[PDB]
Design a protein around this ligand. Structure first.
Ligand SMILES: Cc1ccc(C(=O)Nc2ccccc2)cc1-c1ncn(C)c1-c1ccc2c(c1)OCC(=O)N2
Length: 148
């Protein structure tokens, strides 16, 4: 019984990065969207797209995913992440807001993710799925137009 499917929106937590808005999707080369790392039931991964103007994709462990509703969740995510931060500087980094080009990308991503959330599964899959030209990842022409 899978928690997510292609088109579902999630927040992803990767070490060294803030919680990021994402959408579960199929890996363009592997053609799967979920896997068991080492065939262990506890190490399930999902393939996700990271929302923003500079797109990326990755296999993220399900344990590092929280279903996405909106930016309102973000404050509590940082708080829960800082609660178990093994350092005070590590807790300061998590509670402090995002800066630089990363902030710009994160806000762009929140704008696309909240639009995707207001859409149905098939509408958001048709609009936000990355277009792949051989080995190049491109943003959907419409999404690229709305970003820049
Ligand atoms: C999966 C990935 C691939 C490559 C890179 C990468 O290139 N990182 C890097 C770090 C320092 C200097 C230069 C490059 C980061 C991630 C990455 N891991 C976790 N998160 C949250 C991301 C990520 C961060 C920002 C955006 C993003 C994804 O996608 C949409 C977008 O506009 N911004």
């Amino acid at each position: 019984l899978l928690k997510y499917n292609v088109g579902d929106l999630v927040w992803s937590k990767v070490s060294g990065y803030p919680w990021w808005p994402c959408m579960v999707s199929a890996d363009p080369l592997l053609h799967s969207y979920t896997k068991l790392k080492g065939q262990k039931k506890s190490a399930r991964q999902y393939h996700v797209q990271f929302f923003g103007d500079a797109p990326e994709r990755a296999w993220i462990f399900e344990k590092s995913l929280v279903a996405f509703e909106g930016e309102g969740q973000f404050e509590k995510l940082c708080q829960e992440s800082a609660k178990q931060a093994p350092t005070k500087a590590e807790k300061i980094k998590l509670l402090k807001p995002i800066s630089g080009k990363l902030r710009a990308q994160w806000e762009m991503g929140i704008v696309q993710a909240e639009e995707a959330a207001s859409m149905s599964v098939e509408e958001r899959k048709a609009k936000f799925t990355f277009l792949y030209v051989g080995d190049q990842l491109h943003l959907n022409p419409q999404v690229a137009k709305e970003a820049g």
